[PDB]
């Protein structure tokens, strides 16, 4: 199928308490492989996947150098943006940055992206055409025009269509045992009595990869989305994911309900019936 590489940068200012916190993580699809903590001891980009650990000294020195430059750029942005919005010098603020690229089933470039946020909302984004910008507000305009004259889009486009996809492909090759795998959900239902006339039916999906999954309940066919408690898909901590969906059912009607499961790793969708 298709694949993505995404880098996530978060910078949080800490007035009086020295320089901002800077954290970087990299993912291929749903698997983290990179990560950097300005508060960490190493001061180096560090491996977070087995298949990236033996990449070599040049790689780690190189990502370390570049990631440090990201740290300094964001540190200055924190001040610049503070000035844009005339905000107090005592308050903590957040800059977030996400960029990456996708490749199709054939591993050819599919799309690139570069999003930027200040204090939890959109600030400026690279448009799909990789040539223009979408500015969220007044302050974004100043940055939008600045990047236009600085031909920043061109720089990013060259990265997104070149280095980004080139190394995504390299990683998919290197970590092919991990990244090019599907782990179908191991599923099951549990039954708990709420009262003497009600019961909780919970539908579980465990140990699956990638994260994408659909868990739904039906009663006699009718989707019970509005009566279903559906938790967010969560990491198990070993690279796999978990999810459940539960309904509260009148005791005695258990046979009317079915849990339906869809995942990329399933030959066909699953239908679980308490019986």
């Amino acid at each position: 199928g298709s694949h993505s590489m995404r880098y996530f940068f978060t910078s949080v200012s800490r007035p009086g308490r020295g320089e901002p916190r800077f954290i970087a993580v990299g993912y291929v699809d749903d698997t983290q492989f990179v990560r950097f903590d300005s508060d960490a001891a190493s001061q180096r980009m560090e491996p977070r996947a087995p298949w990236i650990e033996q990449e070599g000294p040049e790689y780690w020195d190189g990502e370390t150098r570049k990631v440090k430059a990201h740290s300094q750029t964001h540190r200055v942005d924190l001040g610049t943006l503070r000035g844009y919005y005339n905000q107090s010098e005592a308050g903590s603020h957040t800059v977030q940055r996400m960029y990456g690229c996708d490749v199709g089933s054939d591993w050819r470039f599919l799309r690139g992206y570069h999003q930027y946020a200040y204090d939890g909302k959109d600030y400026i984004a690279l448009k799909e055409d990789l040539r223009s910008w979408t500015a969220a507000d007044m302050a974004a305009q100043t940055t939008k025009h600045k990047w236009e004259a600085a031909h920043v889009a061109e720089q990013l486009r060259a990265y997104l269509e070149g280095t980004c996809v080139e190394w995504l492909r390299r990683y998919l090759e290197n970590g092919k045992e991990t990244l090019q795998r599907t782990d179908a959900p191991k599923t099951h239902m549990t039954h708990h009595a709420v009262s003497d006339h009600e019961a909780t039916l919970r539908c579980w999906a465990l140990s699956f990869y990638p994260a994408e999954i659909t868990l739904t309940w039906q009663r006699d066919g009718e989707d019970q989305t509005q009566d279903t408690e559906l938790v967010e898909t969560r990491p198990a901590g070993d690279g796999t994911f978990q999810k459940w969906a539960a309904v509260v059912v009148p005791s005695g009607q258990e046979q009317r309900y079915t849990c339906h499961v869809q995942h990329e790793g399933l030959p066909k969708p699953l239908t679980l019936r308490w019986e």
Binding site: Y7, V34, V67, T80, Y84, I124, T143, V152, Q155
Partner: peptide
């Protein structure tokens, strides 16, 4: 691999 160059908001 992360982006090489420069910038400045």
């Amino acid at each position: 691999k992360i982006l090489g160059g420069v910038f400045x908001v």
